[PDB]
Symmetry: D2
Subunit: 115 residues, 4 copies
């Protein structure tokens, strides 16, 4: 149930394909200039006791039009049902010098839904 | 630079290839039963001011022999500098029922060297 | 403002007093546990929220989970006042297990109970 | 073993007193202008299994001389011995309008020593 289009609570969209071999591939859209490659992995053989399915993905915010010198990783789980959701925590890291490496990484969370 | 074999503090091993317009491919190891696919992205065109290179990757802990029902993401940066390092922060999510979701994610930090 | 009884999404109760010097004191029920913390007693005019944080160690007369949680976040006043936080829960582990010592999560607190 | 003067890798210094039933009280500094109150809690009855002692504390970055409109919380554990250390992860949150809340919280790690 992961394959498809997902929307977060504030304008972002991603299209993902979940491969048989646990791969996650797609596009993240924040114009073709706000589109980025997404790649990741997911548990292709989860438990059927009501647990969600573990997954993660990465976007590096560089495309042929712009480069924010920053990458985000999302770690979380897919939960199906009538109300399917991907609940995540993410880490945003920017390229800094050594002296500023202390302030390099933001942390947040994101919920994605199919509508 | 990023391409190579890296080791963290505890002793795990990650072999990565940096290619494409920023693809990260490879394996994580902690023997063949401990090997898992890794996938991520990186800033293929970092700043020229001495900043590091942002990157992220994902490992889902399922292979042909084992399934921990969980995935880890590393968010961080590559420093070419003195000895090259990758300094990361990570999130490990496990699939949980919805009632135990509050304790699904661990957070920690990892430094990699080619030594 | 911040002073009052707060509840998170999971029904836990946070009774806190905001002092005039930026101290936060009170009690947390996830019986009760002592909480202490700090807040910005003079935030920005500009519509910014108020930065704050607090800690609870999960030890009282009944039980001891050998753990402490810290919440860091901000208060946003409004028709619906709310406190948006990220938290870190650290348990005592041996050295070899330290890598799995810390959970991370997010709590939203509100003056109305779920 | 917690009561005293602790130092992180970045210069920063913290003086804490551990009260008998779990209180942590002290100052965080790096001159008066750079001095701020800290308060936290610790497990006043740790396990005897050689596990460490859980604690946490908070500093809000406001004193009589300046206001960063920020608060940092440290969550971690005291590890005793000759090489006594406090290992932490932290969250730094800044006040932000609702529009900039995604980028309000920094995450990182710090290690404290008695020397």
């Amino acid at each position: 149930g992961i394959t498809g289009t997902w929307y977060n609570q504030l304008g972002s969209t991603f299209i993902v394909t979940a491969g048989a071999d646990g791969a996650l591939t797609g596009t993240y859209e924040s114009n073709a200039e706000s589109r980025y490659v997404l790649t990741g992995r997911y548990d292709s053989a989860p438990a059927t006791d009501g647990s969600g399915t573990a997954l993660g993905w990465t976007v590096a915010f560089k495309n042929n039009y712009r480069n924010a010198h920053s990458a985000t990783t999302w770690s979380g789980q897919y939960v199906g049902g009538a109300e399917a959701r991907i609940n995540t925590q993410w880490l945003l890291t920017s390229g800094t010098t050594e002296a500023n490496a202390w302030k390099s990484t933001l942390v947040g969370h994101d919920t994605f839904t199919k509508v």
